[PDB]
Amino acid sequence: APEGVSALSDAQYNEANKIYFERCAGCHGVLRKGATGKALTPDLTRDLGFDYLQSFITYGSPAGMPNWGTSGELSAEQVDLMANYLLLDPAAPPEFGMKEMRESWKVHVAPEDRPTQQENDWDLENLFSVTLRDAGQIALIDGATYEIKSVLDTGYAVHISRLSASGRYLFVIGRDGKVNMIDLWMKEPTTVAEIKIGSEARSIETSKMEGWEDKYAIAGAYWPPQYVIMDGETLEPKKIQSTRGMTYDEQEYHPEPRVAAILASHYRPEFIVNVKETGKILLVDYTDLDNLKTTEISAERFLHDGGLDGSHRYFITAANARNKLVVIDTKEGKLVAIEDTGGQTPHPGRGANFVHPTFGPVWATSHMGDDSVALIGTDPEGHPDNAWKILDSFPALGGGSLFIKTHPNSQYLYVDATLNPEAEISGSVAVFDIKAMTGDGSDPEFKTLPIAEWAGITEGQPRVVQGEFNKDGTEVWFSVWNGKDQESALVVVDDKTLELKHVIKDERLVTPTGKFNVYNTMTDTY
Amino acid sequence: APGAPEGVSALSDAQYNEANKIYFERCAGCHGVLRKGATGKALTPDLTRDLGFDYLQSFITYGSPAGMPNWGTSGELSAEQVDLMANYLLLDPAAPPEFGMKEMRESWKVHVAPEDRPTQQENDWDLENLFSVTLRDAGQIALIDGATYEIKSVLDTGYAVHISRLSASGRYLFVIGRDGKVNMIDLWMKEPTTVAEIKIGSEARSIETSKMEGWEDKYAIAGAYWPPQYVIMDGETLEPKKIQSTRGMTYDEQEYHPEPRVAAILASHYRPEFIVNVKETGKILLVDYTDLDNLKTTEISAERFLHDGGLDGSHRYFITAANARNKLVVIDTKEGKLVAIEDTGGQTPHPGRGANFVHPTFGPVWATSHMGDDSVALIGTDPEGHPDNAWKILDSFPALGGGSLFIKTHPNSQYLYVDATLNPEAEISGSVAVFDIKAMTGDGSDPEFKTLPIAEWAGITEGQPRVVQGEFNKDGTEVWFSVWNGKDQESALVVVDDKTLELKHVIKDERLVTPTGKFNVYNTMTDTY
Numbered sequence A: 001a002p003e004g005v006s007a008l009s010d011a012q013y014n015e016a017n018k019i020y021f022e023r024c025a026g027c028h029g030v031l032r033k034g035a036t037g038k039a040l041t042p043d044l045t046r047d048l049g050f051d052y053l054q055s056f057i058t059y060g061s062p063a064g065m066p067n068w069g070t071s072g073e074l075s076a077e078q079v080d081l082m083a084n085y086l087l088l089d090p091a092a093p094p095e096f097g098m099k100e101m102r103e104s105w106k107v108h109v110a111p112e113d114r115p116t117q118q119e120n121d122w123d124l125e126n127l128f129s130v131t132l133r134d135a136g137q138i139a140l141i142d143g144a145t146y147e148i149k150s151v152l153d154t155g156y157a158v159h160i161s162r163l164s165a166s167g168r169y170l171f172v173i174g175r176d177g178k179v180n181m182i183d184l185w186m187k188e189p190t191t192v193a194e195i196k197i198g199s200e201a202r203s204i205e206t207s208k209m210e211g212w213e214d215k216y217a218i219a220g221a222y223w224p225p226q227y228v229i230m231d232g233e234t235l236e237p238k239k240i241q242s243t244r245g246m247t248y249d250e251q252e253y254h255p256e257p258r259v260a261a262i263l264a265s266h267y268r269p270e271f272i273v274n275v276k277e278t279g280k281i282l283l284v285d286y287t288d289l290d291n292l293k294t295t296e297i298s299a300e301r302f303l304h305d306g307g308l309d310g311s312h313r314y315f316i317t318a319a320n321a322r323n324k325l326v327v328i329d330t331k332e333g334k335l336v337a338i339e340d341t342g343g344q345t346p347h348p349g350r351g352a353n354f355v356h357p358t359f360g361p362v363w364a365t366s367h368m369g370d371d372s373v374a375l376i377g378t379d380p381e382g383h384p385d386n387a388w389k390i391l392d393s394f395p396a397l398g399g400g401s402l403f404i405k406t407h408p409n410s411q412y413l414y415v416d417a418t419l420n421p422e423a424e425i426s427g428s429v430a431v432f433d434i435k436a437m438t439g440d441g442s443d444p445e446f447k448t449l450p451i452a453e454w455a456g457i458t459e460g461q462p463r464v465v466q467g468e469f470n471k472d473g474t475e476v477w478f479s480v481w482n483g484k485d486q487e488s489a490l491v492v493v494d495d496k497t498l499e500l501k502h503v504i505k506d507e508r509l510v511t512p513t514g515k516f517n518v519y520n521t522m523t524d525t526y
Numbered sequence B: 001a002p003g004a005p006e007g008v009s010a011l012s013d014a015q016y017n018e019a020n021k022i023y024f025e026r027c028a029g030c031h032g033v034l035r036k037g038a039t040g041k042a043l044t045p046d047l048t049r050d051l052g053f054d055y056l057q058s059f060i061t062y063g064s065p066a067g068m069p070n071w072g073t074s075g076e077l078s079a080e081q082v083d084l085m086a087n088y089l090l091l092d093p094a095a096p097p098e099f100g101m102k103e104m105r106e107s108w109k110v111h112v113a114p115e116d117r118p119t120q121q122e123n124d125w126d127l128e129n130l131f132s133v134t135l136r137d138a139g140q141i142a143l144i145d146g147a148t149y150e151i152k153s154v155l156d157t158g159y160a161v162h163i164s165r166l167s168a169s170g171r172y173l174f175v176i177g178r179d180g181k182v183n184m185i186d187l188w189m190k191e192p193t194t195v196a197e198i199k200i201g202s203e204a205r206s207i208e209t210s211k212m213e214g215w216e217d218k219y220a221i222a223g224a225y226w227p228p229q230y231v232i233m234d235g236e237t238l239e240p241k242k243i244q245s246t247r248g249m250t251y252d253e254q255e256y257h258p259e260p261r262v263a264a265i266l267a268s269h270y271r272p273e274f275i276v277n278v279k280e281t282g283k284i285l286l287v288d289y290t291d292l293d294n295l296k297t298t299e300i301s302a303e304r305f306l307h308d309g310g311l312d313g314s315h316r317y318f319i320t321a322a323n324a325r326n327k328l329v330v331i332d333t334k335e336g337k338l339v340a341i342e343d344t345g346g347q348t349p350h351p352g353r354g355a356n357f358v359h360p361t362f363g364p365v366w367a368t369s370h371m372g373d374d375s376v377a378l379i380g381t382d383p384e385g386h387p388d389n390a391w392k393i394l395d396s397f398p399a400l401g402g403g404s405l406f407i408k409t410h411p412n413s414q415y416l417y418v419d420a421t422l423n424p425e426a427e428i429s430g431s432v433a434v435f436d437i438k439a440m441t442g443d444g445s446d447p448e449f450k451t452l453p454i455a456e457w458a459g460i461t462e463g464q465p466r467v468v469q470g471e472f473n474k475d476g477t478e479v480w481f482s483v484w485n486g487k488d489q490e491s492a493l494v495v496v497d498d499k500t501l502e503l504k505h506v507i508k509d510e511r512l513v514t515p516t517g518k519f520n521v522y523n524t525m526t527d528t529y
C-alpha cells in the first residue's frame, strides 16, 4: 500500500505556499511543471515519497538545487512542511502587485549616501560581469589583468546582468524575479537596492535614451504576465502593466503571455518589450507614467531574443518557433518586415552587426535547430534592395548553437555550438573572416578554435558558450561551462591572431555562463 | 449525486453544453454571466433551489409583463430546451466563456453588401430631424419623424435593446443591446433596415462611431461588460478588426483586476481616437484608429467607477462621472492627459452626456444632476477665457428631487431641463424641472424652477409612468420626453415647445412599448448638448 499523505492545517499550507512561490517557483515553475529544476507534480513526487523529497530539500544537489536545510535557509520544520506540500496538488499561482513588490523592496544605501564620484581604482568600463549560475553570484572580473575583482551574492537562480546608460549602476536579475542594483562607484561595490517583481522572470533593461540616463530600469516576468518600470536609482516600483491579452493573428484571449527580451530605444524615451505568446512588441514611453503612451505592434508569435542594428534605429528579433525574424523601426514606431531565416529555431542573443564586403550593413544569427548562420540586410537607405532580406545562409560547427558575436574593431564572426551532442563540437567555436566573404553563393570557410582543449578541461561535460568582447574590441572571452562539482574556466582569445591569450581559473569560478562587458553593454555595441 | 438526498436531476455532459450555450447567448444579457442578475432577477442556486424546477419551468415558458420574454409560448425555445434551462439553473454557475475573433466572425452577418446599398437617400424622410427611440421590453427601435411626430418605422434589433448612436454623416444608425448584439441600419434605403449585425460579447452597454473630421463612417466601436474588452469594427460592414482586452492593473493600488468593465465610449473631435471608460481599474483609454496593426493608445489614470460622461461645448474636454465616488474626471483630448478630478458635493452624479451652456456670470459650464439627491452641479469648462473658474464646481442647487438621470439643454434654448425618473414619489417622477439660464446670477441663492407635469400632459392613468431623458429636435426649438410605462400598459412621448414651455404634442401608438432612450439624428451625430 502507498504511503499516507499528511493532512496539513490552513496556516501550515499558507506558509508552505508562500515559501513555494517565493523560493521554488523560479526553478520549478509556478505550476510545478519544471524549468531549470525538475518537475515536482504529485504524479512524480508521490512515487519518490516523503523521505526522498526531505533528503533532497535538506542537502540539495551539486547540480543546481540549493541545500535549503543544511544552509539554514529553511528550518527542519519548514523542510518537512515543504516535503509534504510537494505531495499535495499544485496550488493556483498568485498575483504579484504593488503591495508585494513594495514589501520585498529594500534600499540598503539611500542615494544621498552613495559616492558622488568613482571611489575605487577599478577600470569600470572594461569590467566583465560574469554569471555564476549554480552559486547565486556574479563575478566582476578585470578586463585587462584577468583578475577577479570581486564576487557578489545576488540570489539563487541568477540569470544575467545589464548596465545603466552611464555605466555606474549594475543590474542583475534572477529567474525568480529578484532584482539587484549594484553601485560600481563604491570603494567596495555591493547591492544598494533590491526588489522582487514576480515569481518567474528573465529580463531587465535600463533607460538608454539620451537625457534619460539612470532614470529608469524595467523588468519583465514570465509570471505573473507583466512588466514593471522602476526608479533608476532606488528600484521603487512606479508602474506595473499586465501583458494578458489577445494573440495578434487569431485574436483569442491568452491568459499567460510571457515577457521575453527587453531592449531600450535610442531614438525615443521608450522601452522595447517582447510579449512571447501573443506575438506583440510593445513600445512603452516612460516620459509620463500616469498618462501612459504605448504602441502595441502586431508581429509574430514566439518572440524571444533580438538586438538593434548597427545604427541603433531598428530592432531585429527572433520569433524562434516559427523561424522568423521580425523588424521594427523604433523611430516611426511601426513594424517594417517579417522574414523566414531558412533555418531551424534562430537564437541570436543580441545578434552580430557588421558590414559585409558586398551586401552592405547586415545583422547575423545562428540557430539551435541547425548549423546555419543567416545574414539580413539592415540599410534601407544605402542598400534598398537588400534591406530586410535574408542575403546569405551558411553552415558552422553544427546544431545547438546559442550565440554569434563580433565587434566593430574586428574582422571575425564567432559562433558557438553550446548544445551540440558531440563534445568535440560543443567544446569548440567556429570563426569566419568577414573580409573574406563574397556573397557569390559559396559557403564561407571557418577556423575551429578548441576553447575547451585550450582550458585543459576534459572531465565532465564542458560546454563553451557566448563570446563577449572587451571595451577595445581586441579580445573576446568564452565560457567553458562545467558542472558545479567539475572544473570550469573563462578562455580569452586574441582577436588579431585567433590564438589563446589567457585562461581564467579560480575555486570560486563556479558554472560561469553569461559574461557582460560594462561598456559594450551600456552602449549596445554588437 | 443525482440519487443522493441533496442531488438534482443532473444533465448529460452534452446537454449541459447546450444549456450553457443558450444561457450565455440569450440569458446573461439580463441575468448576468455569473447569474447574479442585472435587469433580470438573480438566478444563483441558493435562490433557484427554493423556487424549484416547476416554478423555473413556468417562468421561462410564460415570462411576464415586467420584462421577461415568453420563451416557451413564443416558440423561441422548444419545450425540451425550457426543461434544460430549468435544470441548468438549479446546478452551479458555470465559468463565463471568452468571446474572441472566431466567435465574433461566426455571429457576423452582412445582409446587404455595401456595393448593393444606395448611393444616395432613396426615401423622403427628413433624416437629420429623425428620432431613434428605444422600445425596451419590445426588443425594437422606433424611427419617429421630428416634425410631423409620426412613427415612420419600427425595427427589430433583439431583446434588451439599450441605446442608439449615429455615424458622423448621419447615414448609418447603430444600436446595441445589453447582450452585446449590434445592429447596423442604412437610413438611405427606401425602407431602412438592418444591413449588418454581429455580437461582441455576453454583456455590453456602449457603442460609438468615429467622429474626427476626415474619418466619417470609417469605424464603429463597442465595449463589453463581459468579457472585459472592446472591439473596433469596420464602419460599413461591422467586420471585427481589432479586439483589445481591458484586463489590467487598478490605477491607484496597482493590483491585477480580472474583470474591468467597459462603461461609456465617446469619440474625440481633436484626434482620430475613441475615448473608452474602464470602470473598475479607473482608466480612461484614448485609442488611435489610424493604424490598427501598430496600435497607439494612451492609458490615463483617473478614478475608479467611471461610468457616463460627455464632451464640453468646445468638444475638446471629456467630462465623466466616477459615480460611486461622487467625482467628475476631466481629460484633455487634445494633449491626451488628465486635467482634473473634482467632487460635485452631491451623491452619485449621473449626467448622461451632460448639459453645456453659457452661465451669465460664470461663463461656459457643463452641468449634471444626481441619482442620490436633488442637487444640480456646474463645472467651469473654459480654461482659456475663465482660467480661475475652469474645472471647479461653481454652483450647486436643488431641482425636483433625488433619483434624477438626465439633464438637458441646447445652444438655441435658455432653459435647462432636469428629470427625476427614479424618485419614489410619482408626483415627482412624472414631472420635469426647468431653470431659466438667463436669470442665473451665481450669487449663492438657489435658482427657482418651473415644474412641467409631463406625465399629466400625456393623460396616462394606468401603471407607474416615469418621465426620462429630454432630447431636442434638430432646430433646438422642441424638447422630447419619454413617459415610460410597463410593457402591457400605455406609454407616450411628450413634445414640449421650448420658447413657451407649453405642451406641443403628445405621441401615442399601440407599438410605442416602453419607450426610453431617444436620440435625434442631428444632435447625436454632432455631439450637440
Ligand code: DHE
Pocket: A035, A036, A131, A133, A158, A159, A160, A175, A202, A203, A204, A205, A259, A260, A261, A262, A263, A304, A305, A349, A350, A465, A466, A513, A514, A515
Ligand atoms: C528571455 C531571456 C533572455 C533575454 C534577457 C533580456 O533581454 O534581458 C535571455 C538571455 C540570456 C543571455 C543574454 C546574452 C546576451 O548577449 O544578451 C544569456 C547569456 C543567457 C544564458 C542562458 N539562458 Fe537565458 N534563458 C531563458 C530566457 C532568456 N534568456 C529561458 O526561458 C531559458 C531558455 C530557460 C530558463 O529556464 O531560464 C534560459 C536558459 C539559459 C541558459 O541555460 C543559459 C545558457 C545559461 C544560464 O545562465 O542559465 N540567457
Ligand code: DHE
Pocket: B038, B039, B134, B136, B162, B163, B178, B205, B206, B207, B208, B262, B263, B264, B265, B266, B307, B308, B352, B353, B405, B468, B469, B516, B517, B518
Ligand atoms: C454604460 C452605459 C451607458 C453609456 C453608453 C455610451 O456611452 O454609449 C448608458 C447610457 C444610457 C443612455 C444614454 C443617454 C444619452 O443621452 O447619452 C440612456 C437613455 C440609458 C437608459 C437606461 N439605462 Fe443605460 N444603463 C447602464 C449602462 C449604461 N447606460 C447600466 O449598467 C444600467 C445602469 C443597468 C443595466 O442593467 O443596463 C443601465 C440602465 C438603464 C436604464 O434603466 C435606462 C434608464 C433605460 C433603459 O432603457 O434601460 N442608458
Ligand code: HEC
Pocket: A019, A020, A023, A024, A025, A026, A027, A028, A036, A037, A038, A052, A053, A056, A057, A061, A062, A063, A064, A065, A066, A068, A082, A086, A156, A157
Ligand atoms: C534553482 C536555483 C532551484 C531552486 C530555487 C530550487 N530548486 Fe529544487 N531543484 C533544482 C534542480 C536543478 C534540481 C535537480 C537536481 C539534480 O540533481 O538534477 C532540483 C531538484 C529538486 C528536488 C528533487 C526531485 C527529483 O526528481 O530528484 C526537490 C524535491 C526539489 N528540488 C525541491 C525544491 C524546493 C522545495 C525548493 C524551494 C525551497 C527548491 N527545490 C528550490 C533547482 C532549484
Ligand code: HEC
Pocket: B022, B023, B026, B027, B029, B030, B031, B039, B040, B041, B043, B056, B059, B060, B064, B065, B066, B067, B068, B069, B071, B085, B159, B160
Ligand atoms: C431581458 C430581456 C431578459 C432576458 C433575455 C431573459 N430574462 Fe429572465 N427575466 C427577466 C426579468 C426582467 C425578469 C423578472 C420578471 C418579473 O416579473 O419580476 C426575469 C425573470 C426570470 C425568471 C424568474 C425568477 C424569479 O425569481 O421569479 C427566470 C427563471 C428567468 N427569468 C429565466 C430566464 C432564462 C432561462 C432566460 C434565457 C432563455 C431568460 N430568463 C432571458 C429578463 C430577461
